[PDB]
């Protein structure tokens, strides 16, 4: 089962995309994240969520590098690029 | 309704024990301290100060005895 190891990473990647999917747009649903240091922050920006999320999954961290290049190049669509990435994984 | 019962039983548990401290015929009392000593007197003012309480209603009854 070399592929089942990758399939376990795809399912874990779709769970992160579904969480950011609810935050798309100004009317989207905010996410509450409590850091280990005790800081409580909340916002609808997908770039700030994945930055402080501290993802330990190796494949799921690729969305952070794409979101960093999304804001550095285009500057907009950091939330939508996560949804489009998870759409190809589901198909 | 359980909070109203706990408020009544907290103050009554302290009052039911000191019932023997009233009058010139008041019976003596004995408290068990961690030290080898003990309180042999029947005075209610000295006994209530040495009793450890939990529910806060008993703490308010102790402050009333100090003013009285």
């Amino acid at each position: 089962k070399p592929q089942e190891v990758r399939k376990a990473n795809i399912i874990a990647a779709r769970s992160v995309a579904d969480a950011i999917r609810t935050s798309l747009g100004p009317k989207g649903m905010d996410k509450m994240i409590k850091t280990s240091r005790g800081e409580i922050i909340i916002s609808n920006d997908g770039h700030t969520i994945l930055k402080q999320m501290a993802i330990l999954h190796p494949v799921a961290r690729m969305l952070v590098e794409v979101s960093a290049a999304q804001d550095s190049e285009a500057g907009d669509g950091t939330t939508s690029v996560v949804i489009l990435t998870g759409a190809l994984l589901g198909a | 309704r359980q909070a109203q019962i706990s408020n009544i039983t907290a103050a009554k548990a302290v009052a039911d024990v000191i019932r023997t401290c009233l009058g010139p015929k008041a019976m003596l009392k004995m408290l068990l301290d961690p030290m080898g000593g003990l309180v042999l007197t029947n005075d209610g003012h000295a006994i209530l100060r040495e009793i450890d309480v939990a529910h806060p209603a008993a703490k308010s009854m102790l402050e009333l005895s100090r003013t009285q």
């Binding site: 969480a19 009317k27 649903m29 509450m32 409590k34 280990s36 409580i40 | 806060p56 703490k59």
Partner: protein, 144 residues
């Protein structure tokens, strides 16, 4: 760390504001009664003001800490009516969670409140009036 979602987090928000509302339920209005706050040290306090209780109220919950900053916002400016604000916000969360079984979208619930809030202010401004009944009746007399 742990991550939750679904209808489980929506039920925790109702149970969190339920215990907070019960603290300000008996303190509403001048007919309210005093309450005691007991910490791990064993000390306590006696006050009839519900605003000072929410300042020392210890509750661990993401939505519960929101009402803490809301109570301090009314005290630093108006200083009155903090108890009534917590009760209103507590019932809005209980009725909104019941609409989940009706397949009601939360943004529509939020949008429905924003539209009704602006229209309610206009209706309140219609029944507002200055001091009247000075001749033939008495108003400020019954206050003292």
């Amino acid at each position: 760390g742990e991550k939750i979602s679904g209808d489980d987090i929506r039920n925790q928000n109702v149970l969190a504001t339920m215990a907070v509302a019960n603290v300000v339920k008996s303190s509403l209005g001048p007919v309210g009664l005093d309450k005691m706050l007991v910490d791990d040290i064993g000390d306590f306090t006696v006050t009839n003001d519900g605003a000072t209780i929410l300042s020392l109220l210890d509750v661990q919950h993401p939505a519960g800490k929101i009402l803490v900053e809301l109570a301090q916002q009314q005290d630093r400016e108006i200083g009155d009516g903090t108890t009534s604000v917590v009760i209103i916000a507590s019932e809005l969360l209980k009725r909104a969670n019941e609409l989940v079984k009706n397949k009601i979208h939360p943004t529509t619930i939020i949008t429905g409140f924003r539209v009704a809030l602006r229209e309610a202010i206009r209706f309140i401004n219609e029944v507002l009036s200055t001091s009247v009944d000075t001749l033939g009746k008495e108003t400020l007399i019954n206050i003292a």
